[PDB]
Amino acid sequence: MVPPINCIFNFLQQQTPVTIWLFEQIGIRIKGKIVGFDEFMNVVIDEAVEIPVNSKGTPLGKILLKGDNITLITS
Amino acid sequence: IQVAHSSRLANLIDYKLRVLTQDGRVYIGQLMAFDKHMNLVLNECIEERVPKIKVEKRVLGLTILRGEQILSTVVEDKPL
Amino acid sequence: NGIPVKLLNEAQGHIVSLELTTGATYRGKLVESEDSMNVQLRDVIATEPQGAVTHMDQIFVRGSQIKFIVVPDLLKNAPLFK
Amino acid sequence: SQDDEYVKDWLYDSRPLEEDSKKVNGTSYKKWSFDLPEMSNLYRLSTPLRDEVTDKNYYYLFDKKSF
Amino acid sequence: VSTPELKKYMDKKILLNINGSRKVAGILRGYDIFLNVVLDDAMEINNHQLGLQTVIRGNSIISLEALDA
Amino acid sequence: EHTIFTQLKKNIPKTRYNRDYMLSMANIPERIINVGVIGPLHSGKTSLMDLLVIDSHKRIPDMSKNVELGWKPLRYLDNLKQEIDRGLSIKLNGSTLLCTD
RNA sequence: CAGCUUUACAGAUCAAUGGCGGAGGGAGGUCAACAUCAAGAACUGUGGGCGCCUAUAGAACUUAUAACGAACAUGGUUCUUGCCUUUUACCAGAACCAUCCGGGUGUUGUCUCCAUAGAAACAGGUAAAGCUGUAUUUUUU
Numbered sequence: 001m002v003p004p005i006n007c008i009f010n011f012l013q014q015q016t017p018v019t020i021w022l023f024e025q026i027g028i029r030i031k032g033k034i035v036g037f038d039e040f041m042n043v044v045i046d047e048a049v050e051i052p053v054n055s056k057g058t059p060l061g062k063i064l065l066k067g068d069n070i071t072l073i074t075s
Numbered sequence: 076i077q078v079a080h081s082s083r084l085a086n087l088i089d090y091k092l093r094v095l096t097q098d099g100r101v102y103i104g105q106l107m108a109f110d111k112h113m114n115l116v117l118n119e120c121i122e123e124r125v126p127k128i129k130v131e132k133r134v135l136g137l138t139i140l141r142g143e144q145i146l147s148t149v150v151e152d153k154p155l
Numbered sequence: 156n157g158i159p160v161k162l163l164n165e166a167q168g169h170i171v172s173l174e175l176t177t178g179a180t181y182r183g184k185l186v187e188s189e190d191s192m193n194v195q196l197r198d199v200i201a202t203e204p205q206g207a208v209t210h211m212d213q214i215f216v217r218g219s220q221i222k223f224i225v226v227p228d229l230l231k232n233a234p235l236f237k
Numbered sequence: 238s239q240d241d242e243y244v245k246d247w248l249y250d251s252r253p254l255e256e257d258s259k260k261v262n263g264t265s266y267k268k269w270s271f272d273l274p275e276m277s278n279l280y281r282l283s284t285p286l287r288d289e290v291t292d293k294n295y296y297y298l299f300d301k302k303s304f
Numbered sequence: 305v306s307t308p309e310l311k312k313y314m315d316k317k318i319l320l321n322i323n324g325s326r327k328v329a330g331i332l333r334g335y336d337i338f339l340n341v342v343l344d345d346a347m348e349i350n351n352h353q354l355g356l357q358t359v360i361r362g363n364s365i366i367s368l369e370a371l372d373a
Numbered sequence: 374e375h376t377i378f379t380q381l382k383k384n385i386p387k388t389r390y391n392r393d394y395m396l397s398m399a400n401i402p403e404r405i406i407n408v409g410v411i412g413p414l415h416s417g418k419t420s421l422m423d424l425l426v427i428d429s430h431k432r433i434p435d436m437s438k439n440v441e442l443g444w445k446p447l448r449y450l451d452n453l454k455q456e457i458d459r460g461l462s463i464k465l466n467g468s469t470l471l472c473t474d
Numbered sequence: 475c476a477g478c479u480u481u482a483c484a485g486a487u488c489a490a491u492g493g494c495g496g497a498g499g500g501a502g503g504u505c506a507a508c509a510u511c512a513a514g515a516a517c518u519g520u521g522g523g524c525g526c527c528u529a530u531a532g533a534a535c536u537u538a539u540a541a542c543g544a545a546c547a548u549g550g551u552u553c554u555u556g557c558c559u560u561u562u563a564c565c566a567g568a569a570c571c572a573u574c575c576g577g578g579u580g581u582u583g584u585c586u587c588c589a590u591a592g593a594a595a596c597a598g599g600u601a602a603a604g605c606u607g608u609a610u611u612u613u614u615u
């Protein structure tokens with residue numbers, strides 16, 4: 001068994017290709033690699049990229065995204 | 076419509092209550108149980124939606140209404 | 156403890172209906188319930204908001220999404236109230 | 238007036254409690270309702286005549302049924 | 305504190321209904337008190353997979369349906 | 374009439390909850406526990422059962438004054454003439470009780 | 475400590491209305507009379523569907539090592555025995571039965587000793603009694 005806290009600790013140490021979907025949001029996705037972790041689901045992401053959905057690679061950098069509006073993570 | 080000048084919700088329990096909902100429906104019936112989170116248990120709940128003309132109507136009976144999806148409460152009628 | 160949530164968990168086993176925030180109704184045997192209404196069903200018909208019925212074996216739901224739950228006429232009788 | 242501090246005053250009476258309106262029904266003398274310590278006193282006093290056998294098993298093959 | 309009893313659904317594929325009519329297929333890996341589903345990623349709704357191992361947030365869950373019996 | 378006794382009547386002692394509800398509940402499994410209380414001689418298991426039953430029902434006929442008070446135990450689940458007079462539970466005289474957790 | 479609900483206050487307007495009203499004692503008594511207490515574990519009423527079935531209210535007392543009594547006699551009839559031999563009187567067992575000494579409640583009434591008010595709330599305040607109260611994923615940030 002793996003709780004989300006432990007799977008994100010794998011994503012923390014690895015820093016492998018993450019793709020993030022967003023809460024109350026279908027129009028945009030993110031593509032980066034997990035760098036931080038809070039006690040809440042707040043995670044800072046370096047090498048992040050704004051990726052509009054397959055209904056292109058748009059510009060985005062390193063971001064502290066407020067993690068209460070997360071949907072997906074996959075490193 | 077008539078009702079006593081009541082202090083709080085629990086004092087007027089088992090009264091026929093028009094209860095609004097955030098999705099547009101209104102649930103009308105005699106309330107059995109309330110909660111800290113405003114979850115309600117209507118004895119003779121009746122599902123009444125407002126479609127885009129005239130009222131939609133349906134009978135449910137004993138049902139739990141979750142509190143989060145409530146708009147407000149209104150007294151429709153007396154007990155018995 | 157929540158006296159409506161009390162009723163829900165007491166209603167386990169009966170053929171109960173369930174509509175969510177999405178407006179998609181359900182109907183079948185209940186299995187599990189908790190403080191946060193983490194509902195499970197069996198033999199559940201799953202009517203979509205349009206009216207498209209899809210029969211399925213089981214389902215699990217989160218409490219935040221739940222709107223209202225149709226309980227039978229048996230819980231009217233006993234024994235939670237008095 | 239120390240061990241036998243409560244009953245001593247009334248233990249030797251025609252009707253043990255003529256009045257004592259709390260402890261008995263009245264003067265009809267039908268019912269009674271003592272407090273604890275006086276009951277204790279009575280018990281202690283009754284040591285010679287008291288039943289003095291708590292182990293209900295004791296009457297084994299010596300009950301009325303057995304007889 | 306009340307742990308959602310997903311040990312009946314542990315190591316089984318599940319059709320997770322999530323925000324905006326989106327679906328997630330995938331075998332279950334674990335969970336927490338907030339219902340955050342740790343699962344092996346599969347095809348997302350014709351159909352296409354994003355990621356290998358995923359962690360879905362509880363707030364975004366609409367439902368989760370028993371694909372496997 | 375008879376000596377080795379039960380109720381033998383229309384008016385069974387009324388329950389606090391209603392037996393219709395109990396039977397309804399008994400429609401589904403995962404909601405019918407078969408307890409079968411067990412133990413040594415004079416564990417008190419029959420007395421425990423009696424306590425449960427009394428708790429459940431309103432007024433029993435057999436629950437006399439003394440038993441209500443709690444001098445004698447209302448051994449409600451030793452119905453047999455013998456099981457009384459002998460002072461032992463001897464056969465299975467269980468009960469179906471809609472029990473609140 | 476805050477909210478609500480209840481009571482003793484002071485005066486209130488006293489409408490609003492309630493409710494305690496077409497408001498009316500208590501404690502006892504070696505005091506009565508009446509009912510009644512061994513029965514499918516057992517009682518009674520109420521409705522309804524045809525003496526009964528079916529839902530509804532109720533139920534003091536006495537009990538489950540079974541009994542009103544944590545107690546204990548007597549009399550009769552038979553049957554059996556003993557002492558005997560003729561009966562009473564008896565021995566002590568049985569089965570039946572009765573009598574008696576008492577008991578319980580419940581209801582009436584009397585007898586006694588104490589009594590002895592035909593109106594208080596609302597607006598609050600004072601003080602006291604019964605419950606509740608002290609955002610960062612599923613309720614409300």
Ligand SMILES: Nc1nc2c(ncn2[C@@H]2O[C@H](COP(=O)(O)OP(=O)(O)OP(=O)(O)O)[C@@H](O)[C@H]2O)c(=O)[nH]1
Pocket residue numbers: 413414415416417418419420421446448460461462463
């Ligand atoms: N001191 C004490 N005695 C008890 C307690 N519970 C029961 N007893 C006594 O011990 C006996 C045990 O309870 P019963 O129900 O009579 O016996 P039982 O459980 O039927 O025993 P079985 O016949 O073997 O099932 C009772 O008859 C009581 O006298 C207790 O809590 N404390």
Ligand SMILES: [Mg+2]
Pocket residue numbers: none
């Ligand atoms: Mg002669």
